[PDB]
Short mmCIF file of C-alpha atoms and ligand atoms in Angstrom, two decimals:
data_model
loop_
_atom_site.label_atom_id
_atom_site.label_comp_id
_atom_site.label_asym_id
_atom_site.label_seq_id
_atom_site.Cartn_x
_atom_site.Cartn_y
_atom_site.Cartn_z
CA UNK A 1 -28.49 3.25 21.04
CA UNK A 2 -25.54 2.68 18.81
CA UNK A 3 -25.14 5.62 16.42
CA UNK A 4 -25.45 3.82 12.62
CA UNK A 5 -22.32 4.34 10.55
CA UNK A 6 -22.41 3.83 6.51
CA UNK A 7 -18.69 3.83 5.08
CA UNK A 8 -17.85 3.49 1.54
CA UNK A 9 -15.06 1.63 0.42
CA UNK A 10 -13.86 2.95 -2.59
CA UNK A 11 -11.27 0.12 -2.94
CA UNK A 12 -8.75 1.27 -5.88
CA UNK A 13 -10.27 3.36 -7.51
CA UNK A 14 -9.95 7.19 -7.75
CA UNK A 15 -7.41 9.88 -8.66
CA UNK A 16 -6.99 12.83 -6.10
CA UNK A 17 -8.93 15.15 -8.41
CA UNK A 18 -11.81 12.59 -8.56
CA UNK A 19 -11.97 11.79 -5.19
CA UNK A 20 -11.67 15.81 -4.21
CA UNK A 21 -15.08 16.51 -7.09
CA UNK A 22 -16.68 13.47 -4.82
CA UNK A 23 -16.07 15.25 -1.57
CA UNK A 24 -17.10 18.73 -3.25
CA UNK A 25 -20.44 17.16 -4.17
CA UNK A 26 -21.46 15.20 -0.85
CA UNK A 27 -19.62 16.77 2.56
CA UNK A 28 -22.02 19.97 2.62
CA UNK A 29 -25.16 17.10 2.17
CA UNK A 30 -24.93 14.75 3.96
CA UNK A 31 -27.48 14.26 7.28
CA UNK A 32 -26.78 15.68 10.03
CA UNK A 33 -23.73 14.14 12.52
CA UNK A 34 -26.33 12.82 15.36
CA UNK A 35 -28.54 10.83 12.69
CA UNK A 36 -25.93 9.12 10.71
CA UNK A 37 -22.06 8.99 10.83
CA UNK A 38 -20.86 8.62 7.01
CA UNK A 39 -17.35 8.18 5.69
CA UNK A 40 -15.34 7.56 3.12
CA UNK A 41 -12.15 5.21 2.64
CA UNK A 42 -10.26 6.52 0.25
CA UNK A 43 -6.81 5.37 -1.51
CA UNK A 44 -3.73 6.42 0.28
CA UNK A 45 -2.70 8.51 -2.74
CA UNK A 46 -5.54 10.17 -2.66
CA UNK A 47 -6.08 11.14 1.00
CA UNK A 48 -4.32 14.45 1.68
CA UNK A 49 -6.45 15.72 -1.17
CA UNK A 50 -9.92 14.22 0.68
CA UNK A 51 -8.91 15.24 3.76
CA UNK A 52 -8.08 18.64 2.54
CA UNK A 53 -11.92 19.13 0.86
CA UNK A 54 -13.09 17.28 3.94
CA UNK A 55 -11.95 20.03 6.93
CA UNK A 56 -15.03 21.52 8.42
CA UNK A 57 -17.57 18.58 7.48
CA UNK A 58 -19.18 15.60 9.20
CA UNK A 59 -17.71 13.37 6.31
CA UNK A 60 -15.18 10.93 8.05
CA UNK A 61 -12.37 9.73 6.51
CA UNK A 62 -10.63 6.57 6.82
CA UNK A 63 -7.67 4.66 5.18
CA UNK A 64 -8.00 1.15 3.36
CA UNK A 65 -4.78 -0.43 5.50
CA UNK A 66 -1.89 0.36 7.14
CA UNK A 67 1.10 -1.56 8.53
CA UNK A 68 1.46 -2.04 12.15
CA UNK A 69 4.79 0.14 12.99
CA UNK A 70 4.87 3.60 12.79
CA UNK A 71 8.15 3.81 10.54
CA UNK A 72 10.83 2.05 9.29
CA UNK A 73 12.60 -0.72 6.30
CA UNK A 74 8.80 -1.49 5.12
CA UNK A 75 8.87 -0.26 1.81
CA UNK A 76 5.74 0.41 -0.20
CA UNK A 77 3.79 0.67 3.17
CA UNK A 78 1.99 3.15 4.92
CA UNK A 79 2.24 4.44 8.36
CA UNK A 80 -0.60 4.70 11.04
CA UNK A 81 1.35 7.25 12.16
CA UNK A 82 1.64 9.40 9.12
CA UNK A 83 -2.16 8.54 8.57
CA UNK A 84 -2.75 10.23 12.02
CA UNK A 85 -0.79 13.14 11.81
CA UNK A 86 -2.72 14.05 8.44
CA UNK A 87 -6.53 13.59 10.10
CA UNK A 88 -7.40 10.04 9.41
CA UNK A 89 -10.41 9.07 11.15
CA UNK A 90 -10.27 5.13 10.50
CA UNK A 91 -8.59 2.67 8.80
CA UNK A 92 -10.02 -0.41 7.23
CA UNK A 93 -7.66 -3.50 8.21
CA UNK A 94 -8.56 -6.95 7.00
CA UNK A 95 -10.86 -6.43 4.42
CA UNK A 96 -11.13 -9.81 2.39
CA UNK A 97 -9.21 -8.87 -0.76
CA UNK A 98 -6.30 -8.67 1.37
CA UNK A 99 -6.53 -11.34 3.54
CA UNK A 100 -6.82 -13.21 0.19
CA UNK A 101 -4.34 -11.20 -2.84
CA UNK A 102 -2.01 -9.58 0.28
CA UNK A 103 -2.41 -12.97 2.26
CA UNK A 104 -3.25 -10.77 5.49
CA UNK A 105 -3.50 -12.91 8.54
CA UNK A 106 -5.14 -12.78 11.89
CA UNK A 107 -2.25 -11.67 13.45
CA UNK A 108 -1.25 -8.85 11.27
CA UNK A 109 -4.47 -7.69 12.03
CA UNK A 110 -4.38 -7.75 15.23
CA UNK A 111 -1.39 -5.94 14.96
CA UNK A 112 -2.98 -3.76 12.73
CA UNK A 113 -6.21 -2.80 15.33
CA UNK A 114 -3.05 -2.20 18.30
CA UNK A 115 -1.43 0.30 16.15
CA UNK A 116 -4.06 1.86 15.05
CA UNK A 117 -5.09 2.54 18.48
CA UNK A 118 -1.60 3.47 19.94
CA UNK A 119 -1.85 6.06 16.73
CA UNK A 120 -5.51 7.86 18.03
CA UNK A 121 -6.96 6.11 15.38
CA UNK A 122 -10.32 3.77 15.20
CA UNK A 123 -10.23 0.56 13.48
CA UNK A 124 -12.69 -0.51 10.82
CA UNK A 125 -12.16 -4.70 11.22
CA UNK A 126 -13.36 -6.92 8.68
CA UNK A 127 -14.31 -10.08 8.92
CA UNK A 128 -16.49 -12.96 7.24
CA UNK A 129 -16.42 -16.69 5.86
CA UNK A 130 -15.91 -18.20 2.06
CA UNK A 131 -18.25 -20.25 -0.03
CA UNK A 132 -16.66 -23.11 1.15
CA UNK A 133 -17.10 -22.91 5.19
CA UNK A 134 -20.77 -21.36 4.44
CA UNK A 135 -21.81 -24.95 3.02
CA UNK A 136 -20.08 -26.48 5.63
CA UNK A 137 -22.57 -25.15 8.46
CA UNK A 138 -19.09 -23.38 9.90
CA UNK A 139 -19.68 -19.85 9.20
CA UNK A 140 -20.03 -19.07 13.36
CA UNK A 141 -16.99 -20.53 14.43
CA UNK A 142 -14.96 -19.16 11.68
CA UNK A 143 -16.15 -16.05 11.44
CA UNK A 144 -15.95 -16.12 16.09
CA UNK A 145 -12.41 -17.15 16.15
CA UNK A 146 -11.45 -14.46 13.32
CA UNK A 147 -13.42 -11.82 15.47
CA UNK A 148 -11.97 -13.37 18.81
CA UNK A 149 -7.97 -12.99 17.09
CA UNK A 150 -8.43 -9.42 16.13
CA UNK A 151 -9.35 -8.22 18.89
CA UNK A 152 -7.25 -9.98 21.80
CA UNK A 153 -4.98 -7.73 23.51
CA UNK A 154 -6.95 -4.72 23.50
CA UNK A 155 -8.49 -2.77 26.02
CA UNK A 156 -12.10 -2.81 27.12
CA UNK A 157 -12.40 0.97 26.25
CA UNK A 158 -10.89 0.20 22.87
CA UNK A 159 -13.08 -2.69 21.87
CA UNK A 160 -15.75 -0.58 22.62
CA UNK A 161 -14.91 1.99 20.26
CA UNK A 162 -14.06 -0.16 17.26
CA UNK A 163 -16.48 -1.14 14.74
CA UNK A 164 -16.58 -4.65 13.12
CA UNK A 165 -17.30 -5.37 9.27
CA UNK A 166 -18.98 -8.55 8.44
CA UNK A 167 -18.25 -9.77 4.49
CA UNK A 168 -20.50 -12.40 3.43
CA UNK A 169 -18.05 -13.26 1.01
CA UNK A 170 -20.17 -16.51 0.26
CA UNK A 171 -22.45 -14.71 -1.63
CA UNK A 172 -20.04 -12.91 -4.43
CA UNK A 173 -21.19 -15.35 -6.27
CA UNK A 174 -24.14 -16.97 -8.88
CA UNK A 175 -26.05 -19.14 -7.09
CA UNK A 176 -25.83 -17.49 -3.40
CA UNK A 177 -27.49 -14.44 -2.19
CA UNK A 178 -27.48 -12.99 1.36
CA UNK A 179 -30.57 -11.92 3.09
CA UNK A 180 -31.14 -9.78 6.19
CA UNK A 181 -31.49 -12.24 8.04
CA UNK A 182 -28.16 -13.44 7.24
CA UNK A 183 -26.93 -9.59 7.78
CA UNK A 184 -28.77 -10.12 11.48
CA UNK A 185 -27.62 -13.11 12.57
CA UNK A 186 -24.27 -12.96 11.18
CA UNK A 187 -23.57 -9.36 13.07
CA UNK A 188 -25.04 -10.99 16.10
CA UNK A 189 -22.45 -13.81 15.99
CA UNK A 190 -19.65 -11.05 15.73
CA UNK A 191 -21.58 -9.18 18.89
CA UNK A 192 -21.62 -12.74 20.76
CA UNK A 193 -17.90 -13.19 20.23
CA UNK A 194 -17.23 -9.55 21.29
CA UNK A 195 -19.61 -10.36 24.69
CA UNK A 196 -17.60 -13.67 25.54
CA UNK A 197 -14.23 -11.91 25.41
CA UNK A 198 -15.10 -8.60 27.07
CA UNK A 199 -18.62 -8.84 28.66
CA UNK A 200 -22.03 -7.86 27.14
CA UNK A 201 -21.59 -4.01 28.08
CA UNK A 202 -18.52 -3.72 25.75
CA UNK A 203 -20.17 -6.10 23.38
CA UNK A 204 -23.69 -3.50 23.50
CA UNK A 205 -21.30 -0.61 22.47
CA UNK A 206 -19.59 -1.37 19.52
CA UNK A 207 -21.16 -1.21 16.37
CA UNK A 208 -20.96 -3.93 14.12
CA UNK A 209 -21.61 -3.57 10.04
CA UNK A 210 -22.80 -5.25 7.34
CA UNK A 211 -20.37 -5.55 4.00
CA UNK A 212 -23.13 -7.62 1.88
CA UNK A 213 -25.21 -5.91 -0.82
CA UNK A 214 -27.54 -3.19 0.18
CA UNK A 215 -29.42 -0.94 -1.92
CA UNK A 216 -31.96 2.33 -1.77
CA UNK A 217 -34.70 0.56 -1.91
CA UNK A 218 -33.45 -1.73 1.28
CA UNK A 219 -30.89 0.09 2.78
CA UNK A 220 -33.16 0.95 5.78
CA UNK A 221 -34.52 -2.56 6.17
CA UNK A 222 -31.06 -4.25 6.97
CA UNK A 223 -30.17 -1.43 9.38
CA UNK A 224 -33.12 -1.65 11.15
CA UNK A 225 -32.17 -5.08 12.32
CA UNK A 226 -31.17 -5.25 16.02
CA UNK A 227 -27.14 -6.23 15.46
CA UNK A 228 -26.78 -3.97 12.37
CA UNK A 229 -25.42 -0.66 13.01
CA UNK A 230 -24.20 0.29 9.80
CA UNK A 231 -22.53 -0.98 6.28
CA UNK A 232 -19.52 -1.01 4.65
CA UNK A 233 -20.42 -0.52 1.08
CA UNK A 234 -18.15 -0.97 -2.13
CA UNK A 235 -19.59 -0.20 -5.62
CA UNK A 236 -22.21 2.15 -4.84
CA UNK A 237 -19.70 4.64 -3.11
CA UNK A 238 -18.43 5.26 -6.29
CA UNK A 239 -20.83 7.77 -7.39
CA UNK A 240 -21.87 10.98 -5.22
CA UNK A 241 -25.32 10.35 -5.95
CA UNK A 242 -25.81 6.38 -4.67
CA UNK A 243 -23.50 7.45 -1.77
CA UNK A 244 -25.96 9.77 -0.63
CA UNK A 245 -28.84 8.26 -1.44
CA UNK A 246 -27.73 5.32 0.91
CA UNK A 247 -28.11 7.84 4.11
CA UNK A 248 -31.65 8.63 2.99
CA UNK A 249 -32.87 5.73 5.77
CA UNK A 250 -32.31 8.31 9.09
CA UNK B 1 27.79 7.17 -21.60
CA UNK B 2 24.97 5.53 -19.03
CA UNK B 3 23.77 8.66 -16.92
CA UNK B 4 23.91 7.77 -13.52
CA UNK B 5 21.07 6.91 -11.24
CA UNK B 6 20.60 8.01 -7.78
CA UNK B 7 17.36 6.72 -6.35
CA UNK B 8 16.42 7.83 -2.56
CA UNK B 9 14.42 5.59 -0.93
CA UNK B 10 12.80 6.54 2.36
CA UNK B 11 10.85 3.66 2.45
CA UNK B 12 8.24 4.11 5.34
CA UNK B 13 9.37 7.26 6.70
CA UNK B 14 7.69 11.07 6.55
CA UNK B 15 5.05 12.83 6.53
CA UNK B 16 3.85 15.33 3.98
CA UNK B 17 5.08 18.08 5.73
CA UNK B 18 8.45 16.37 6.26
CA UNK B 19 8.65 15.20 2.12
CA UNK B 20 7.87 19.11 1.62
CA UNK B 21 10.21 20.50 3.44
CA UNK B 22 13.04 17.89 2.31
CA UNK B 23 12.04 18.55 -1.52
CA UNK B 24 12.44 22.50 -0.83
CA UNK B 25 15.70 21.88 0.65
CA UNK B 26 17.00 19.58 -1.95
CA UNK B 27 15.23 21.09 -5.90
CA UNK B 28 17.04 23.96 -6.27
CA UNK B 29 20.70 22.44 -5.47
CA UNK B 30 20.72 19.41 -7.36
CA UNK B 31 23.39 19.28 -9.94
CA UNK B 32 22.86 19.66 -13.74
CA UNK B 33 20.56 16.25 -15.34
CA UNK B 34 23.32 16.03 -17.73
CA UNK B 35 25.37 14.91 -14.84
CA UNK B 36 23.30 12.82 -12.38
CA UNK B 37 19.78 11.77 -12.23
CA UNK B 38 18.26 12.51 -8.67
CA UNK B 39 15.36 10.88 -7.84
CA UNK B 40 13.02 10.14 -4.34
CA UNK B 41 10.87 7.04 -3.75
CA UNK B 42 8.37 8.46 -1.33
CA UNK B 43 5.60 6.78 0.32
CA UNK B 44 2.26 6.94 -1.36
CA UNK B 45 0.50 9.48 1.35
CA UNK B 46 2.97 11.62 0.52
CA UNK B 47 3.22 11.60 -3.20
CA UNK B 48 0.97 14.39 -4.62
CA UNK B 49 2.59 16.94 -1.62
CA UNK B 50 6.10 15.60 -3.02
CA UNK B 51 5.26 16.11 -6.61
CA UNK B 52 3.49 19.43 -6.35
CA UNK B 53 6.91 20.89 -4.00
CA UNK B 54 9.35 19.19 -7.07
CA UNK B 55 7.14 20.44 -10.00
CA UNK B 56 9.73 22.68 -12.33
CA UNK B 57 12.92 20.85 -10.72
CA UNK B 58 15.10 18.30 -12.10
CA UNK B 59 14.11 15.90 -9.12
CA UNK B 60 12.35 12.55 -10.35
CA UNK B 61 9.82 11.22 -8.06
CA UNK B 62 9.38 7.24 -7.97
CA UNK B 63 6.45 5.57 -5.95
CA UNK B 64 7.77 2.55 -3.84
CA UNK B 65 5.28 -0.25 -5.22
CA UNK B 66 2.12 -0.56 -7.37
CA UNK B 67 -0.50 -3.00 -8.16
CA UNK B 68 -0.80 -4.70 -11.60
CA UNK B 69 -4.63 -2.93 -12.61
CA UNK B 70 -5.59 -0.02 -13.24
CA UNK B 71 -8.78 -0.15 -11.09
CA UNK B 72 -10.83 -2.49 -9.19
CA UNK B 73 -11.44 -4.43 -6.05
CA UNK B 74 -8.46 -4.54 -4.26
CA UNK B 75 -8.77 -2.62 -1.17
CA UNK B 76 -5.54 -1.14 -0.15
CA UNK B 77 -3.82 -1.11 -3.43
CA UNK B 78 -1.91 1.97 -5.09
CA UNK B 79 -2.90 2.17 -8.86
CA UNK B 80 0.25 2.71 -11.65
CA UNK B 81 -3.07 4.75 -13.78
CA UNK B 82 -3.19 7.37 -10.78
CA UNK B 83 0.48 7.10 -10.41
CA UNK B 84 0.90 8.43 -13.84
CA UNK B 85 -2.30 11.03 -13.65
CA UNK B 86 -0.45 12.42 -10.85
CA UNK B 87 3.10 12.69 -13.12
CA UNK B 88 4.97 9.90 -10.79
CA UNK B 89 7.94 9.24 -12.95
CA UNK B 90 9.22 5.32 -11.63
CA UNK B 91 7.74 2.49 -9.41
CA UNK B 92 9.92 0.88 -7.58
CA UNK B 93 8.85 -3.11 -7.40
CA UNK B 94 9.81 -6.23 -6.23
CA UNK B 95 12.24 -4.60 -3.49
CA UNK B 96 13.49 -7.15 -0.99
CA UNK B 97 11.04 -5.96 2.08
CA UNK B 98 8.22 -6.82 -0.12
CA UNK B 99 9.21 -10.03 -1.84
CA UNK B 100 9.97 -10.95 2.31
CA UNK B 101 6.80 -9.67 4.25
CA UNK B 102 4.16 -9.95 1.50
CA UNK B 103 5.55 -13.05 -0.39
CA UNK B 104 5.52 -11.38 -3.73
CA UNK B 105 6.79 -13.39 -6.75
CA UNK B 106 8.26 -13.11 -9.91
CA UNK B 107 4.96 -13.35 -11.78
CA UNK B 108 3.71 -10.40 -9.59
CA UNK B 109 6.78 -8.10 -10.50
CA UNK B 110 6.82 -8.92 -14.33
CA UNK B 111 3.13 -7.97 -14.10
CA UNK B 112 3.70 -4.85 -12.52
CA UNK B 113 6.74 -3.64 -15.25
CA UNK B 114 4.51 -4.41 -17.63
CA UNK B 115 1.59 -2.24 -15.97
CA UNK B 116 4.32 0.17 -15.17
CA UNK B 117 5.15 0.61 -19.12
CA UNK B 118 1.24 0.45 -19.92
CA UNK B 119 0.92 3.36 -17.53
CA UNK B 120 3.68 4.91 -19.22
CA UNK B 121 6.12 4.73 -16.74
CA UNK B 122 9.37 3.34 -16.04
CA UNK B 123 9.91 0.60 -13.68
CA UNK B 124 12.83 0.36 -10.38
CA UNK B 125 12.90 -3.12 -10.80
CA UNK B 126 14.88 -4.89 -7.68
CA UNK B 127 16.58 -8.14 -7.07
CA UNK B 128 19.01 -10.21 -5.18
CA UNK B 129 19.76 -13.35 -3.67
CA UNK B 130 19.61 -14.61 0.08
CA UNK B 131 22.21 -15.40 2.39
CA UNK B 132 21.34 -19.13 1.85
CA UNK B 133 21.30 -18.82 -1.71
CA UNK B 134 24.22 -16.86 -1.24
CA UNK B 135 25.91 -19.50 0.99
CA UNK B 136 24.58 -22.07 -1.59
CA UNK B 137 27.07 -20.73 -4.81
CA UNK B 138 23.97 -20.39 -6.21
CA UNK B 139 23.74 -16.54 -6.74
CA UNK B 140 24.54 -15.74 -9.99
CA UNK B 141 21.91 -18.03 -11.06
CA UNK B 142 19.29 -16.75 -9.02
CA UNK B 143 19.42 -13.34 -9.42
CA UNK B 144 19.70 -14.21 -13.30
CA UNK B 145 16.50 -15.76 -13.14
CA UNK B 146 14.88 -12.99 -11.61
CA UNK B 147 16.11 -10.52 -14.23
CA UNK B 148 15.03 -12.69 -17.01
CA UNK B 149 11.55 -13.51 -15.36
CA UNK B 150 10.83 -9.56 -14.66
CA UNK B 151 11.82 -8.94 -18.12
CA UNK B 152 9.85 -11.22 -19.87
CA UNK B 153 7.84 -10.02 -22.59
CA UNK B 154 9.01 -6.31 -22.23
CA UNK B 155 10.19 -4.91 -25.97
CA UNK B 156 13.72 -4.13 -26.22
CA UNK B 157 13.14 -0.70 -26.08
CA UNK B 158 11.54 -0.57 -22.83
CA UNK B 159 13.92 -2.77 -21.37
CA UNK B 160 16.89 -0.03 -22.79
CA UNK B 161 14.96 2.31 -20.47
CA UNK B 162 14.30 0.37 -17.64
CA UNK B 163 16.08 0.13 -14.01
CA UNK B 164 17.37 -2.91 -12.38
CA UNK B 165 18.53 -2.60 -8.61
CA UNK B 166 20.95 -5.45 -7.12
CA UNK B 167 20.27 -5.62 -3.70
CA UNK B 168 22.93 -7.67 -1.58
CA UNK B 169 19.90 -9.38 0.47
CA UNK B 170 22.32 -12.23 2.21
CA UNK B 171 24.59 -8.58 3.28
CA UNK B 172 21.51 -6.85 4.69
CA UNK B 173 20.96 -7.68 8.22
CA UNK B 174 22.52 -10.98 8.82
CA UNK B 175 25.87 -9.82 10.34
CA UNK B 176 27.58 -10.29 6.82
CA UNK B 177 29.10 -7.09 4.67
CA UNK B 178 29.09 -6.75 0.85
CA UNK B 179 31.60 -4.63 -0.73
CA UNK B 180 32.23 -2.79 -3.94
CA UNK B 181 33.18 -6.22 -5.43
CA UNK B 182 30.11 -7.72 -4.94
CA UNK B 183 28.64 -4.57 -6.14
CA UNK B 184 30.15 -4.56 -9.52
CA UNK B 185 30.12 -8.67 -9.60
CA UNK B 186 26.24 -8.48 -8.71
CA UNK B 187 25.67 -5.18 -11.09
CA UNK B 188 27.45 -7.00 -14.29
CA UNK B 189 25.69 -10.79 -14.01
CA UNK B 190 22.43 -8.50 -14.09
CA UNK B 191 23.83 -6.97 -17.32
CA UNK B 192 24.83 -10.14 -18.50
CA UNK B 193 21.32 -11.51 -18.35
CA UNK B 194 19.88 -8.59 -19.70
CA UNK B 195 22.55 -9.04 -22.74
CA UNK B 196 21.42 -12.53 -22.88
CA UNK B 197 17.98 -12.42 -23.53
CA UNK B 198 17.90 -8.83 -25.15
CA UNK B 199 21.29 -8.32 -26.61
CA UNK B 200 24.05 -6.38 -25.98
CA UNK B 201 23.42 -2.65 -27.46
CA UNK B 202 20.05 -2.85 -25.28
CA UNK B 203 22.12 -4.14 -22.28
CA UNK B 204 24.92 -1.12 -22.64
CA UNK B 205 22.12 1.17 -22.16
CA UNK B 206 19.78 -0.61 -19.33
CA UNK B 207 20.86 1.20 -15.90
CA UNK B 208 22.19 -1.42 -13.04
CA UNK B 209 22.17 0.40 -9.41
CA UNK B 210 23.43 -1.22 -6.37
CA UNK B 211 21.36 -1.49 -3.61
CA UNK B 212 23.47 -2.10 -0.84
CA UNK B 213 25.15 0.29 1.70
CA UNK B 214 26.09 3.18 -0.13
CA UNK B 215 26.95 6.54 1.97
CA UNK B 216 27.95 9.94 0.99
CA UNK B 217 31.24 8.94 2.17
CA UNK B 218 31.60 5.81 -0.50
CA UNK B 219 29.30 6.78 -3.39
CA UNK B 220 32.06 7.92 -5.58
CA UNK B 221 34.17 4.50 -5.06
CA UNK B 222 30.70 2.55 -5.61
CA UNK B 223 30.15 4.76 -8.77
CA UNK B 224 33.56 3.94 -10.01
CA UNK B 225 32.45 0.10 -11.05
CA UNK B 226 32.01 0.15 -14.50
CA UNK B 227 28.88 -1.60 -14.48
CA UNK B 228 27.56 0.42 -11.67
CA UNK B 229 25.30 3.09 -12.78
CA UNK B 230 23.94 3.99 -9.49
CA UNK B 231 21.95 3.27 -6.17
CA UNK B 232 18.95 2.97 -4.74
CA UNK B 233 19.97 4.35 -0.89
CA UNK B 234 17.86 3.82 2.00
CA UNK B 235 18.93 5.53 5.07
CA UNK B 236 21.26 8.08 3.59
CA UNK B 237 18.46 9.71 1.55
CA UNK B 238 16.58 10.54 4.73
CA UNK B 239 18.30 13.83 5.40
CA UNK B 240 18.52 16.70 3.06
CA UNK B 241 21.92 17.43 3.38
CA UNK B 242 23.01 13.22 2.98
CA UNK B 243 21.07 13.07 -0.15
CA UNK B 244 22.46 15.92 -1.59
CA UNK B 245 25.92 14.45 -0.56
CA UNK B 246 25.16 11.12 -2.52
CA UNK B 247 25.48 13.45 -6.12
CA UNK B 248 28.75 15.41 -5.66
CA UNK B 249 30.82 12.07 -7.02
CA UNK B 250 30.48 14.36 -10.83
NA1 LIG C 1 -29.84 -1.60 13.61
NA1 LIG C 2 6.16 14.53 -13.30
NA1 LIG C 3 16.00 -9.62 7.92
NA1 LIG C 4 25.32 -5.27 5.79
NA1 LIG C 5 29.94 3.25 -13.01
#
C-alpha cells in the first residue's frame, strides 16, 4: 500500500511573497497526512520563505536541483547541504528541462540521488523518453537504462525510499497525447527496472509518479492504476485552487 | 575617478544563518561608498536572508548566475524578474566554473546581460582565457572576443555601467601563478575592447576587476594597476574579518 504523493513543480516561476500567499492559502487545507502526501517544489530563491509559512503543516517541500557536493568553487549552485539544514524535504534532480537546457546527464544524477541521501534528504528522480525514441518502439529500454543509471550505487533502504518521476515528454506536443494506459505501463517499466536491480520487495516500496497531463476531472483515474502512486504536476500547481483541487481523489 | 569594485564571492558556501551573521558583522564597518564599493555574491538560498540583514547598509548584494526569462519551464532556474523584486543589485554571469561544468556560451551570457539590464540590473560579467589558449599566444584575442560577444547589442550607457571580471583561468588550478602584470595586462585588453566597439569615454568609465588571487595582504598592490578597478575574491570573502580587510587599500 504505497502512500500516493502529488508534487507540484512550480518550475521558475514565483517570487518569495507569491510563493509565501500560495502556502498561506493551501497548508491549513490540504487532506489529511495518511490519505495523501502533497508538496511543493519551489525555486531556490524562494524556499526559506516557503519553508518558513510551511512549519507546522503536512505540506512538503522540496527543491528543483541541487549539485552533488556539499560546498565549494561551484558558483551559481546550490548545496544539498544548505537545502538540508533549512528543512528541505526533497529535491527534484533530472527533470527533463535540465537534462536538455542544463545538459544534465545520468551520472550527475546519480550523483545527485547519493548526495541527496548522504544530506537526509529524499530524491524526486525524473525520468522519461523523447518524441523520437517513442516512434522508435524504444521507450522501455531507454527509459530502463536511465532508471537503472540513477539509481546504481545506492542502498536497498534508499531505493526504497526514493520516488521516481516518469515524463512522457513525447507527448508535449500536437499530434501525441498520453493515456493512462501509457501512465500504467510506463510506471510499471520504471518498477520492473527498480525489481531487476534490487529485488521485487524494494521495487513494491517505492513509489513511482506520473509527470504527463492530469486534470480534476481524471486525476483519480490515473492514480488508481496499479504502478501509479502519485504525479508530478507543472502548470496546474501554479494556482492554490487547481493545486488543491488535484488532492480531491483520496 | 572609476570607484572601485570589491565583489565577494562565496560561491557555494553558507547557509542563511551563516550569510546573516557575516552581513551583521560586516554592514556597519564598511567604509564610506564614496571610497569603495562592497559588494557579496551569495548563493540563491540565501539571498532574501542576505538582503533583508544588509537592508539600510552600503553593502551591494549580487546573485551568482541567472537565467535569460523571466518565467517559464525551466525547472531549476533562478529568475533576474525575482532577482530584482527582491532588490538584488548585480548577477554575476558567465564565471569560469559555469562556462566549465555547465558548458555555457557566449550567446547564453550576452542573453543574460541583456535580461540583467531588462530586469534593471547590472551585470558581473566574467571572462578569461585557458591555459591552452594561454599557452597558445592566443589570449588577448580570446578574451577580446568574449567582451565584444557579451556586449553585443547593450547601449553605451549600460555598458558605462556595467562590470567586466578578468579571470586568469590558465592561473587557477593548473600549478601556474598570475601576477599583478597579468592583472593589469588582462584588465586593460578588456578595456581596450570595450573602447573598441563602444568608444573610449564609455570605456574610461566601464569597471574592469581582476579575478584572480587577490588577498587582504595584496589588494592594495592589485588596486594600484591603473586599469584595475577591483576584484571579484573567492576565498578571502568567506570570513568577516578577510572581507573587511580587502577595503582598507583607501
Ligand atoms: Na495507484
Ligand atoms: Na536592494
Ligand atoms: Na580545474
Ligand atoms: Na594560481
Ligand atoms: Na586601479
Amino acid at each position: 500500500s504505497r502512500k500516493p504523493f502529488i508534487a507540484g513543480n512550480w518550475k521558475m516561476n514565483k517570487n518569495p511573497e507569491e510563493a509565501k500567499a500560495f502556502v498561506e492559502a493551501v497548508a491549513s487545507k490540504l487532506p489529511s497526512s495518511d490519505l495523501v502526501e502533497a508538496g511543493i517544489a519551489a525555486p531556490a530563491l524562494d524556499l526559506t520563505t516557503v519553508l518558513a509559512v510551511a512549519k507546522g503543516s503536512n505540506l512538503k517541500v522540496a527543491a528543483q536541483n541541487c549539485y552533488f557536493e556539499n560546498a565549494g568553487a561551484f558558483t551559481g549552485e546550490t548545496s544539498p547541504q544548505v537545502l538540508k539544514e533549512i528543512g528541505t524535504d526533497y529535491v527534484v534532480i533530472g527533470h527533463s528541462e535540465r537534462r536538455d537546457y542544463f545538459h544534465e546527464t545520468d551520472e550527475d544524477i546519480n550523483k545527485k540521488a547519493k548526495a541527496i541521501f548522504a544530506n537526509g534528504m529524499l530524491p524526486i528522480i525524473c525520468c522519461g523518453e523523447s518524441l523520437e525514441t517513442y516512434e522508435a518502439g524504444k521507450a522501455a529500454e531507454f527509459v530502463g537504462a536511465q532508471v537503472s543509471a540513477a539509481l546504481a550505487g545506492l542502498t536497498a533502504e534508499q531505493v526504497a525510499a526514493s520516488v521516481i518521476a516518469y515524463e512522457p515528454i513525447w507527448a508535449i506536443g500536437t499530434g501525441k497525447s498520453a493515456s493512462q494506459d501509457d501512465a500504467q505501463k510506463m510506471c510499471k517499466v520504471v518498477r520492473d527496472v527498480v525489481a531487476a536491480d534490487f529485488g521485487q520487495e524494494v521495487a513494491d516500496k517505492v513509489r513511482v509518479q506520473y509527470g504527463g497531463s492530469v486534470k480534476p476531472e481524471n486525476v483519480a483515474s490515473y492514480m488508481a492504476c496499479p504502478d501509479v502512486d502519485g504525479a508530478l504536476v507543472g502548470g496546474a500547481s501554479l494556482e492554490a485552487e487547481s493545486f488543491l483541487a488535484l488532492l480531491d481523489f483520496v
